[PDB]
Amino acid sequence: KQLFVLRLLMVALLATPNKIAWHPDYRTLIDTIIELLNINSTWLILQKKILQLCIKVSRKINDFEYVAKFSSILITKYTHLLNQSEQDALFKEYIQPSITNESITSYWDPFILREVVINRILDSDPTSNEIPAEFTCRVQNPFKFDFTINDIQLDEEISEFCEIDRKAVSYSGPYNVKAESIRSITLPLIIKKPTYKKIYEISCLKISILKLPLQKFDIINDSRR
Amino acid sequence: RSLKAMGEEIWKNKTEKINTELFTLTYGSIVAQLCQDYERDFNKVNDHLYSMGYNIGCRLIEDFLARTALPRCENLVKTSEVLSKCAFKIFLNITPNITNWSHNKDTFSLILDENPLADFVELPMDAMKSLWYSNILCGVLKGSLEMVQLDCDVWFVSDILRGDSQTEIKVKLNRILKDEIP
Amino acid sequence: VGPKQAITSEASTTYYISRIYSESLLFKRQEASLSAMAFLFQEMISQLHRTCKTAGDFETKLSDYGHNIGIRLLELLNFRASSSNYITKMRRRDLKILDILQFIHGTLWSYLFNHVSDDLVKSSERDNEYMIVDNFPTLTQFIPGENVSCEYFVCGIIKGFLFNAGFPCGVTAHRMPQGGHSQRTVYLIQFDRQVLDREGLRF
Amino acid sequence: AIETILVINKSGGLIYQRNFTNDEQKLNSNEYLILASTLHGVFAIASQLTPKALNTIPYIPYVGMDDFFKEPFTNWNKSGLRQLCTDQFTMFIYQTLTGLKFVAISSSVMLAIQIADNFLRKVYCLYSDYVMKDPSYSMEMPIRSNLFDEKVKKMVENLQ
Amino acid sequence: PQYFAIIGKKDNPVYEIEFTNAENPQGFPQDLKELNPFILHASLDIVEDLQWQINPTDNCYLGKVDHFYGLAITAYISYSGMKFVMIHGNSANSSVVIDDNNMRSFYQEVHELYVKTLMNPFYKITDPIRSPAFDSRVRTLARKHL
């Protein structure tokens, strides 16, 4: 019942047309709304509604690391029950002010790249390895496609380039990926170089989505090395 | 007849009887834990519960022949159908019926009218296709007739709770020598 | 009414009697032989000595079956004893500990093994510990019980009779030959302090 | 009258031995196994003598005061060794349809085959309820159920 | 305008459903979201500190228990763990009508539908029920007692 009446206190703060700058008790008020649950209960739609109220308070009172914190925790711990309706299409506009701020880092999803192939393109007749599942790369073009699962658009992949290995590094990626599907990728374009020949393995590579450069997003359900 | 009447006679003996609800609940708990543990691999729980059945198929027939002092089963079809028709009812009190022969009555069926292993189970929608609920009977019958040297080959073809209306087991009998010195 | 979906549905202004599978649930009687259920238990304990490492994890990996079906036997054993279904009433729930361990003593054993365990002794030195002794255990009478690891079917089955009842409880078994009745097994159970303190608010 | 009981598995090896009431011993374990292998070798050839050159049932006296099944039953042992007699003891054999041989050796003389057959259906029932239902018992191994052993030790004094 | 819930031991709703009378032809528009879990969450609070005592001989059924400022709630406690809650009432009137015995012949009557689904050994505790048949049965079991 204390959570019921404090939910009414928060909807009183939404419906008030008077204006507020942040008072240092709304820290503890939104902290105790979250810790009357056990969330860091298995009534998930209650968590959807009570996090939507916490996000709307943190908009109206402008505590930007808390709209960062609790909307990142909303996107990570939920959204199997969020299609393009129930305000997910009218959401992610609410967190481009998080990313045009310095607020959130790291691009929360650790499941992006679906697989890796460095499939070739034949150019000449017998310019090949005529006397020597490894690759021993021949000078040509790669293709490594990915998926999204969050059904928002605009995840602009930029600067997809490789890890701390040799001059075999990808060039540029100036286009985006799609809302829902497992989108194919356009031109990673390794600029490979003859070095010493001992075996050097990749796992993944850094990707930035309008944001800071990450680490190697390890591929699903397997190495897929 | 003789055998048919002494089935209801030899139901009344020394070692006591307990209600089938416990036995059904134990079997349902075993198959639920094995269905949960192998990550819905319904093919693998079929052969695991099959070997679970066969490893007491090896050991059922000694208690059957001891508690029911019975002679050698020389006919391989009609004595077999009437002994299994009394021989479920000595262990789990049920009377199956027998039809659906070959030409030479070889691949005969055994229709079970009502099953106590699943009185009340509604097996779930993913588990429709690659599972039978009660293949422990296909374990224990193949063991219990291999130890009398009859190389059977049982399999389910239909049950209730995969959708169909009859519960029956078809069985091919291969042949095997070297019983004993009589 | 999926977890992903809402609680949404439609109006009451029709009548959909398209139903498939609902039957009686009464106390049927079919009474299979102790050899058959003994072989079922036998190859179950064979699987658990196959797949499991040492003593205590095997004890837990036996008692989990009892936790699977203890809830199930609790609710319709109570729905048959303290109550188709042209129902008069449903009677009183667990008042305390001493009616609910009377309820194992009254009508759990006589639901399972057609008799009554001979005592339900409240312990001398403490009150969180309680102890029930079965005199001649039915489903494990063939196993030479010098290892007492084979009777943790029934410690698992009574723990799931009390975990729904709101008394979390360490439940153990020992075996002690106090009488001319041989191989009688004591189920010295415990509790936690907190529902003992919920009993300890007022008694 | 009986003082030692063996049981034999179907692959020609001893399973159990108890020198019940003789209480002075000179035989350890593997000489009894030499007896078990040689009686399996004897019972091999002890059918095909066929000296004929070409329905028999046992009966019910209620040995062992209830019994298990009060009826004159059949027996599978239509051709082979049944009993022996010497000047210091006598011995008995009962086979199953499965293949277990069920020895009983008696120091004195004690219809005489039939009472020692009617004893030996009981212990084969008692074998197949008290160490057949035992998860320590891996197959065709010795018998280490003490629960088996006093329950057949009770039936020696339920004989004499 | 009626709202059923079965809410579990660790606050999970194992079965929750609404329906409407066609004389209302909709249900609680703009009130359907405050009359959901928060009111029911406090209903779990009051049956949490109402079950374990003898006294505020019918220990299971409890009838009407509380009242927010638009309607009023009813309850039921089973010894399976589960706490059945029906939320009824036309939104215009303050609906007073607790029949108290014929909807006592709903809670012990929906109980067996929970029983036979609990007896499905593939069905666990702490997971909801997408039976396509047991949810079509209960509205027609509520066609008995509206």
Swiss-Prot record, chain A:
Record's subcellular location: Golgi apparatus, cis-Golgi network
Top-level taxon: Eukaryota
Function statement: Specific subunit of the TRAPP II complex, a highly conserved vesicle tethering complex that functions in the late Golgi as a guanine nucleotide exchanger (GEF) for the Golgi YPT1 GTPase. TRS120 plays a role in the YPT GEF activity of TRAPP II in concert with the two other TRAPP II-specific subunits TRS65 and TRS130.
Misc: Present with 259 molecules/cell in log phase SD medium.
Record text on subunit structure and interactions: Part of the multisubunit TRAPP (transport protein particle) II complex composed of BET3, BET5, TRS20, TRS23, TRS31, TRS33, TRS65, TRS120 and TRS130. Interacts directly with TRS65.
Family listed: Belongs to the TRS120 family.
UniProt-recorded name of the protein: Trafficking protein particle complex II-specific subunit 120
Organism classification: Eukaryota, Fungi, Dikarya, Ascomycota, Saccharomycotina
Swiss-Prot record, chain B:
Pfam families: TRAPP
GO biological process, one term: cytoplasm to vacuole targeting by the Cvt pathway
A Gene Ontology term for the protein's cellular component: cytosol
Record key words, sorted: Autophagy, Endoplasmic reticulum, ER-Golgi transport, Golgi apparatus, Lipoprotein, Palmitate, Transport
Subcellular location as annotated: Golgi apparatus, cis-Golgi network; Endoplasmic reticulum; Preautophagosomal structure
Residues in the signal sequence: none
Gene3D superfamilies (UniProt xref): Trafficking protein particle complex subunit 3
Lipidation positions, renumbered (S-palmitoyl cysteine): C73
Family under the similarity heading: Belongs to the TRAPP small subunits family. BET3 subfamily.
Job description of the protein: Component of the TRAPP I, TRAPP II and TRAPP III complexes which act as guanine nucleotide exchange factors (GEF) for YPT1. TRAPP I plays a key role in the late stages of endoplasmic reticulum to Golgi traffic. TRAPP II plays a role in intra-Golgi transport. TRAPP III plays a role in autophagosome formation. Required for sporulation. Has a role late in meiosis following DNA replication.
Subunit record text: Part of the multisubunit TRAPP (transport protein particle) I complex composed of BET3, BET5, TRS20, TRS23, TRS31 and TRS33. Part of the multisubunit TRAPP (transport protein particle) II complex composed of BET3, BET5, TRS20, TRS23, TRS31, TRS33, TRS65, TRS85, TRS120 and TRS130. Part of the multisubunit TRAPP (transport protein particle) III complex composed of BET3, BET5, TRS20, TRS23, TRS31, TRS33 and TRS85.
Other remarks on this protein: Present with 2370 molecules/cell in log phase SD medium.
Curated annotation (Swiss-Prot), chain D:
Key word Endoplasmic reticulum present: yes
S-S bonds: none
Intracellular or extracellular location(s): Golgi apparatus, cis-Golgi network; Endoplasmic reticulum; Preautophagosomal structure
GO cellular component: cytosol; endoplasmic reticulum; phagophore assembly site; TRAPP complex; TRAPPI protein complex; TRAPPII protein complex; TRAPPIII protein complex
Similarity remark: Belongs to the TRAPP small subunits family. TRAPPC4 subfamily.
Its biological purpose: Component of the TRAPP I, TRAPP II and TRAPP III complexes which act as guanine nucleotide exchange factors (GEF) for YPT1. TRAPP I plays a key role in the late stages of endoplasmic reticulum to Golgi traffic. TRAPP II plays a role in intra-Golgi transport. TRAPP III plays a role in autophagosome formation.
Misc. remarks from the entry: Present with 3130 molecules/cell in log phase SD medium.
Name of the protein: Trafficking protein particle complex subunit 23
Keywords, alphabetical: Autophagy, Endoplasmic reticulum, ER-Golgi transport, Golgi apparatus, Transport
GO biological process: chromosome organization; endoplasmic reticulum to Golgi vesicle-mediated transport; intra-Golgi vesicle-mediated transport; macroautophagy; retrograde transport, endosome to Golgi
Entries under Pfam families matching the protein: Sybindin (PF04099)
Keyword Transport: yes
Swiss-Prot record, chain E:
Alphabetized InterPro entries for the sequence: Longin-like_dom_sf, Sedlin
Gene Ontology CC: one annotated term: TRAPPIII protein complex
Keyword vocabulary terms for this entry: Autophagy, Endoplasmic reticulum, ER-Golgi transport, Golgi apparatus, Transport
Gene Ontology biological process: endoplasmic reticulum to Golgi vesicle-mediated transport; intra-Golgi vesicle-mediated transport; macroautophagy; protein-containing complex assembly; retrograde transport, endosome to Golgi
Span of the signal peptide: none
Xref: Gene3D superfamilies: 3.30.450.70
UniProt cross-references to SUPFAM superfamilies, sorted A to Z: SNARE-like
Family: Belongs to the TRAPP small subunits family. Sedlin subfamily.
PANTHER family named among the record's database cross-references: TRAFFICKING PROTEIN PARTICLE COMPLEX SUBUNIT 2 (PTHR12403)
Biological function: Component of the TRAPP I, TRAPP II and TRAPP III complexes which act as guanine nucleotide exchange factors (GEF) for YPT1. TRAPP I plays a key role in the late stages of endoplasmic reticulum to Golgi traffic. TRAPP II plays a role in intra-Golgi transport. TRAPP III plays a role in autophagosome formation.
Name the UniProt record assigns to this protein: Trafficking protein particle complex subunit 20
Taxonomic classification: Eukaryota, Fungi, Dikarya, Ascomycota, Saccharomycotina
